From Swiss-Prot, chain E:
Record's subunit section: Homotrimer, with large domains that extend into the periplasm, interacts with AcrA and TolC. AcrA may be required to stably link this protein and TolC. Interacts with AcrZ. Part of the AcrA-AcrB-AcrZ-TolC efflux pump.
Name assigned to this protein: Multidrug efflux pump subunit AcrB
Membrane spanning residue stretches: 37-50
Job of this protein: AcrA-AcrB-AcrZ-TolC is a drug efflux protein complex with broad substrate specificity that uses the proton motive force to export substrates. (Microbial infection) Involved in contact-dependent growth inhibition (CDI), acts downstream of BamA, the receptor for CDI. Its role in CDI is independent of the AcrA-AcrB-TolC efflux pump complex.
Inducers of expression: Positively regulated by MarA, Rob and SoxS transcriptional regulators (at protein level).
Compartments where found: Cell inner membrane
Organism: Escherichia coli (strain K12)
Inactivation phenotype: Loss of susceptibility to contact-dependent growth inhibition (CDI); inhibiting cells still contact the target.
Family under the similarity heading: Belongs to the resistance-nodulation-cell division (RND) (TC 2.A.6) family.
Amino acid sequence: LPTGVGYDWTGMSYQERLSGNQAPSLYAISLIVVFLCLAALYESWSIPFS
Amino acid sequence: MPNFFIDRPIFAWVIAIIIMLAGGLAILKLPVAQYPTIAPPAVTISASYPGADAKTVQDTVTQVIEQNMNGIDNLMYMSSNSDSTGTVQITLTFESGTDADIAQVQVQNKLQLAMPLLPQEVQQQGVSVEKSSSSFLMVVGVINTDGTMTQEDISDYVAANMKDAISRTSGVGDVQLFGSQYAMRIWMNPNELNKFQLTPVDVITAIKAQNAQVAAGQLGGTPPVKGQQLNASIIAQTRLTSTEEFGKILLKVNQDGSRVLLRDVAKIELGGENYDIIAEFNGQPASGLGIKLATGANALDTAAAIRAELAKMEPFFPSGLKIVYPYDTTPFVKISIHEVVKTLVEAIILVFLVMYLFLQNFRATLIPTIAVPVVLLGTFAVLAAFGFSINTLTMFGMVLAIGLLVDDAIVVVENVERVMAEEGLPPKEATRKSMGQIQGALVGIAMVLSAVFVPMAFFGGSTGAIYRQFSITIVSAMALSVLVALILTPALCATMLKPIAKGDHGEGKKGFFGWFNRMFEKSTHHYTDSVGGILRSTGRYLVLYLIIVVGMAYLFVRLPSSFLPDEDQGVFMTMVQLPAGATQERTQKVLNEVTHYYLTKEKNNVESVFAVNGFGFAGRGQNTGIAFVSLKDWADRPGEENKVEAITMRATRAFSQIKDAMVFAFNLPAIVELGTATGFDFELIDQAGLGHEKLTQARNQLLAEAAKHPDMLTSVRPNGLEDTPQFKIDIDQEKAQALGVSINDINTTLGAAWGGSYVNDFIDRGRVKKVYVMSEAKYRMLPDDIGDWYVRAADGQMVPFSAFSSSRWEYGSPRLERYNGLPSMEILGQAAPGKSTGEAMELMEQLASKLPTGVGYDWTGMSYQERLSGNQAPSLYAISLIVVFLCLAALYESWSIPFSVMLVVPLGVIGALLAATFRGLTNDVYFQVGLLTTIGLSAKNAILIVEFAKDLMDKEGKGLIEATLDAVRMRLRPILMTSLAFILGVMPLVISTGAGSGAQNAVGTGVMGGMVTATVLAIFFVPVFFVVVRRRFS
Amino acid sequence: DIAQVQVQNKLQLAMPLLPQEVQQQGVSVEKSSSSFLMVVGVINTDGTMTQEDISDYVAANMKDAISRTSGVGDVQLFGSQYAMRIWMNPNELNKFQLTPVDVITAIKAQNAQVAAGQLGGTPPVKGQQLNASIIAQTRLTSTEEFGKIL
Amino acid sequence: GADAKTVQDTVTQVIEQNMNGIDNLMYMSSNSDSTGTVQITLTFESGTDADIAQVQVQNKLQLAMPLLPQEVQQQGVSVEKSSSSFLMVVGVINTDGTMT
Amino acid sequence: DTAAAIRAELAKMEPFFPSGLKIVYPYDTTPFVKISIHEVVKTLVEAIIL
Ligand SMILES: NC1CCN(C[C@@H](O)COc2cccc(C(F)(F)F)c2)CC1
């Protein structure tokens, strides 16, 4: 479009964009948390990695 | 717990990783501000009644609003000012912890119901309720370097183009315009008005009639006919848009057929809504935006965003328009926080170096280098959890807690090291033995330091809010340090430390390290022998301890008290006060002299001067002014003579020679949200409707009586303006009726001509702007100009003001004050040197008790806080002392041994007091928190010494003297190395002289002195206390 | 607090439609118990003050501060504050061909405080040396000035 | 009686000027109608206390209220928690046909 | 607490009253509350003694 006209998402689309944006960080944090829990419980890094 | 995590090092590492991740998340998400919310929440009501004196505003606005300020929750007090400029300013102060949003909504809601009772002009101008408990994050000035734009033009441009985008910047909480939009000014000529048979009333009526918005209707609107096909909105008369349109307004058509327009009887232009205040930046016209930071926002990021937005704006500006920053204290905040962070990092590095010097082991040194940062990150996480921010108080509290953190890490690592070097056990078994030795002591120490530091969180008022930051920070740091010492440090010792031979303690090494080991062994032997000799003659050293306690009490009573050190923030202020009746031009001349002096005699130090003519502090008028002087960067102002204190002293000395003006230069308070010192704010209330004159007489009597006590009260002065001449127009309404002149017309003519009248709005370039009608300046200057104004009568003949009104000169107040809804006068003072604030307050109460009947008094401001939180300290610390005794008795399973530990407080207190006294520092907040930290470290050392001694006495058959000597021998090294690390860490704070050096010196000098004397004295006084206690109570 | 906030937010929509007398008297929104926390009476032992004098003293010197005390939800004055009372005589109004409308207009015109402006007010002319507030008609303060209203 | 442009410049712009700086504000959308009506919906972050947000919006709206036309003030500027979806529609008819 | 605050405010007012003016408390249930709670506390102490 011409210069000076931008866009944005509002309402349902805003929430959809937020969910999509924050999904990968959620996955990374959950994987890290599970890895740390396994390392704490089984007293190892090999078992968490496997 | 220590044994659990020695077999599970990975679980300890997982806990540490969780703590570090939480701390990092907090650091990324924490707010940053110079100070937290310290002032009690306050809500301020502002109204304007143009052209009105103080009494008119007070009787028509102030009292009406004050009589409706009922049913508002958590209100400490209320005060109000009514100024001769026509403005009422009412401040309602609520208790700390009150929800500022709820207080503001309640205040405005009670005012919305009071609104119908106010004059229509006040309603038209609007009454605004705001939060005055906060200050400006930044001031962005806009100047014109070509002279093509006046102050009004710059203000209008800033309003139209800059205010919106600045307000939309992230983190910006509020934007106040230093100016106002354009206003359609109608400058009336009384001669032309009389020539064309007109008055100001006619001008206002014509403007209202011919400049309005009319609701027209709609074509084919519902309910329509059964065959309508077109529906359109009808547009009709709309507001005017240009000065030419206003000039064409028709006032009357003469009999001969001539047309009288508005331009015929007046000049039409685009001026300002108000002309009371003129802002200049280095002598050039200037406008500005005052930006307040939003709640929970990062001050540094917000300032950076504001600057980025301004830089984006720069290209589109009209030629000659420039952006300046007269009040930029953000650099001070940045440098202060950076200095604190550098202090923390250098403290960690020095801990590493001292650990390597004393233990000569790389992994042992690494262990604290891991432990301490974990505790710091956890402390950041804890601050974020409880809704705290990164500010000066919290960061200095962290600096203070570094001592305890490093002490814990050093204690654990050094004890494991010593067990390895003595018993020859491997790292795991040695760590088990060490933690079995010291874990109960660590837990008891955590409890004791909790008892020591928690009570500060329960102080009341602004001082209590200040102390709560340190309390929470240090308590969280200490708790996390203890948890780390119980969880991670044992695991790190068990997994990282290498084995050491049974008999190896560095003697066989060569070089500097071998020499140091031999010297330390010899010093330990000498110290052990000296302690053994001391224990044979404990009575002499008990007498010496009594001497130390007496000296401590003497120094404490002789040490002056304060709140916060005054800082060189790169800016300061200069107030100009001219005599009563001085006009804007005289104040402008004086401010020009001040600006010339600052830009010539201090050109090497001053970067710019922002002179505001029209309002100073504690008043606003043509005779008052304020200049905000900005200094160059500290790197460009080296030496004591080039700092704010010296510059202000020199400027005041230079300005003392200015005649017919009081010009006084001074520095900002530590927290600008409070104007506070070692002084008192006192209110003298008219409790029986005596009147203004009797209240003035009572105030004068009180001032004389206070001046008759120079040894206790200093500079007791009123915080207000004296009565000034006023011009009274006494209208004889009988003559007006006889001449057929309506008194309403007379009053409207007088007010519109001399006071100015707001008529209605108009749409300029798509923005609503006010329309003002006022007399042209030439005809409303002097009393004689009153004769130039005529008013039509019922007969149609003009009558002069002299025909139905007389004039004279009287005396009246240019500023009327009320406290708690009653007339009042404010008196500021301070206790004389060597006298406490409480004594000055008591003397002022005694002097007030001898005042005329019907005159009461009250304490407001900091005096109110003093009167509430007066005796709370000693009780809070008697509770703390009792809880410490109980915790120590639990730890040692003895009702008497706790005293041997508790008797160590004076050893550090005396050193802190001596260091403060020699350097001349005061008993301020930073000194007190450093004193508490020194007491905590000394108590920790004494607790460990007594624990070792009692363990030797009980778990082994060793005697009292033998156990004490062995305990002190074992504990000498960790004590000395921790003290060395902390002292070297605080050297930069002690020696600092740059930005933020006031707080740095206040924190560092007391810590240095207390730590030095605690380390020196405790190492041979704690054994004496333990031996004496065990002998007397066994 | 929120209940009162919402109630007042709805009431400020109706306020413009209420009669001007109701607005001038003052619409109030309280959040208080329906029963008195206490009753603070005021008497005169010497007997030198009438009930009206005591009521006026309580209203003018005691009621407002008590209403501002925290926790006080509502205050009911067992009496009333003083006001300047004009007891009209219809026979004398008819004698001079006057009505209560004329009396009210005269009171409004001759008992007022007017913003009269300033000497040397801003924007001033160059060389202006004097700045003073102009004082004009002030509100009457006694029961002798109202009696002199023409 | 004011078109969309005039009411926008006189009301909507003035009101939305002061709406910046309110806590937890995701965004805001306003519309100005030819009948002089103005709506300004401020959508806050999920989990925000709606009552506190309404109180803050009222506090910021006071700073603009006196700057609006007197006709607006006579009609009244309302601030209230809003929803954009109908929970239900309850219709009413007459089965006799007697009522219009 | 509100009754205590009211009494404190009245105490602040009294010094400036006209001659003969006096404050009385024709209706106040707070004394009943004080004596009731005190009586229950007394019964507790006597119960411990018994
Ligand atoms: N109509 C307008 C005309 C222009 N001025 C502007 C001055 O207020 C700016 O001066 C300052 C600068 C910095 C801080 C302050 C503080 F003290 F308020 F924090 C005041 C106000 C009224």
